[PDB]
């Protein structure tokens, strides 16, 4: 048979299928998608004018900036790909330093300075490991905002311009969120944060390709009123949406969660071969523990003082971790692996 659908030319128009629940929905609106698994092929950050960028780093370094920390994982890949082109620009301009770009290890730590746009000592270090002779507080950070999108099949370019002043808030041009009925997402080039209402609205699972340190902009937040920072599962300082969707009954903010892993997967389920029980007799909440010993022994029996099941768990490169509230029932013994 025949049906009736509203379409608009300047919105997301099309038909879309949901296999479970067997719902074909067609119309026009906003399609918020999970960009984390496809990002390396789908998106490429690109600076507006390598010449204008090169002069601003010179002007920064003259004003005492030794280096940069990338805000996002994409931004780091950008500095790697452009470094050969920048250093060629610097030599023609007799600038007395060169630009070196290192890996992205763990949390994308936060720098305190800014690179102002234009109209030992010898290296301007981008990223790499943490270094005291070029400390974070001497480095610029979160210096790009999106100017325009390069819309296409296959690759999409994201052209960025240097900001005019410093800001701790993530760049909202890259961010999105959406909710319909009883599912909700906050989403990013690197975060995918799912919450749903089963009797009560709560955080259901998340996917992290990077762990960053910008603040999540309120303007792209669901339910951002009356949030208590101590109750945000994903901590505000690592970009947790300041939202009641970022809650989970019986858990508090995972400031000591395994965020060092730099890339990890959060949801609510037991780790393989362990059990968690709700026991007031448990140890107090503390820094997150790995369910596998330093010696590969699995830690069988866990408990939590007043959390709620299923237990908050993180999955990482080297194994499975439980939220801070979960503790070994045999108390501190053995060869334990703990986060910071």
């Amino acid at each position, epitope marked *: 048979g025949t049906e009736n659908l509203y379409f608009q030319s300047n919105a997301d128009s099309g038909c879309v299928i949901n296999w479970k629940g067997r719902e074909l929905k067609c119309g026009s609106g906003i399609f918020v998608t999970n960009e984390v698994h496809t990002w390396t092929e789908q998106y490429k950050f690109q600076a507006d004018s390598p010449k204008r960028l090169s002069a601003a780093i010179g002007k920064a370094w003259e004003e005492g900036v030794c280096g940069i920390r990338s805000a996002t994982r994409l931004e780091n890949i950008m500095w790697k790909q452009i470094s050969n082109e920048l250093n060629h620009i610097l030599l023609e301009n007799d600038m007395k330093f060169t630009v070196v770009v290192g890996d992205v290890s763990g949390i994308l730590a936060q720098g305190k300075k800014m690179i102002r746009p234009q109209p030992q000592n010898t290296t301007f270090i981008i990223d790499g490991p943490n270094t005291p002779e070029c400390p974070d507080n001497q480095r610029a950070w979160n210096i790009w905002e999106v100017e325009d999108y390069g819309f296409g099949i296959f690759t999409t370019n994201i052209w960025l311009k240097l900001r005019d002043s410093y800001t701790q808030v993530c760049d909202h041009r890259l961010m999105s969120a959406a909710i319909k009925d009883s599912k909700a997402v906050h989403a990013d080039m690197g975060y995918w944060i799912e919450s749903e209402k089963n009797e009560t609205w709560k955080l259901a699972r998340a996917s992290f390709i990077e762990v960053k340190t910008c603040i999540w902009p309120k303007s792209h937040t669901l339910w951002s009123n009356g949030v208590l920072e101590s109750e945000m599962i994903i901590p505000k300082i690592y970009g947790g949406p300041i939202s009641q969707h970022n809650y989970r009954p019986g858990y508090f903010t995972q400031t000591a969660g395994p965020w060092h892993l730099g890339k990890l997967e959060l949801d609510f389920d037991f780790c393989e*071969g362990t059990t968690v029980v709700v026991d007031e007799h448990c140890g107090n909440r503390g820094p997150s523990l790995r369910t*596998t010993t330093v010696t590969g022994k*699995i830690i069988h029996e866990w408990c939590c003082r007043s959390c709620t099941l299923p237990p908050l768990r993180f999955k990482g490169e*080297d194994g499975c971790w439980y939220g801070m509230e979960i503790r070994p029932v045999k108390d501190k013994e053995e060869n334990l692996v703990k986060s910071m």
Partner: antibody
Amino acid sequence: VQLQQSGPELVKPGASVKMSCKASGCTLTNCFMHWMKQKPGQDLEWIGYINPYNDMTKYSENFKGKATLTSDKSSSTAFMELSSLTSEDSAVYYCARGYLLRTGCFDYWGQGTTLTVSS
Amino acid sequence: NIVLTQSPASLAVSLGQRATISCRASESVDSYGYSFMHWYQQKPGQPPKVLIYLASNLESGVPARFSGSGSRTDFTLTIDPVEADDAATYYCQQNNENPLTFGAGTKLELKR
């Protein structure tokens, strides 16, 4: 935890071989079968690992195109296959129980499968 | 990658003496407060066998004359007193970061 590796192999250049490693006494939480290549009296190279129950696999960069890890749960067996074969591949391939990244050591080892690549 | 360089390449020691082998890593092998370093003994024609796991832990059922020490980049295997059985090659290995890497080896030769 007892590891039994396949027998020796003689293979023509450019062909392919698939050797096996069955693991008795394992649990889901351990039982990462690591694979190493050792030419006679030379350094061991790490290829990767596979968990017969999890299908978790990780390859080293040097071997990404060369080796392919597969698994059969019921057999709790690991399989490693070596793509286009060259004389540089003639060596002993060791199977050995390990763990994830910052976890444990090489507890137990299979006996080793010797491969000779020759026309 | 983390490259382990072992010294010396080959060692000759008399019965009952003290043997010292060292392993030098290109990057720290330390994480979570542990040193992810191990020592192996390989008799010829045989799989390797673990002696020290982590920097300084005697493997279960390995004679207590074997001992390990160190942190970060520098580590040392000590055999005391070395006996007739220990004629073998000795490997260090790290699993702090992928790929797991081994030392080149130290061939121990006994002096009698």
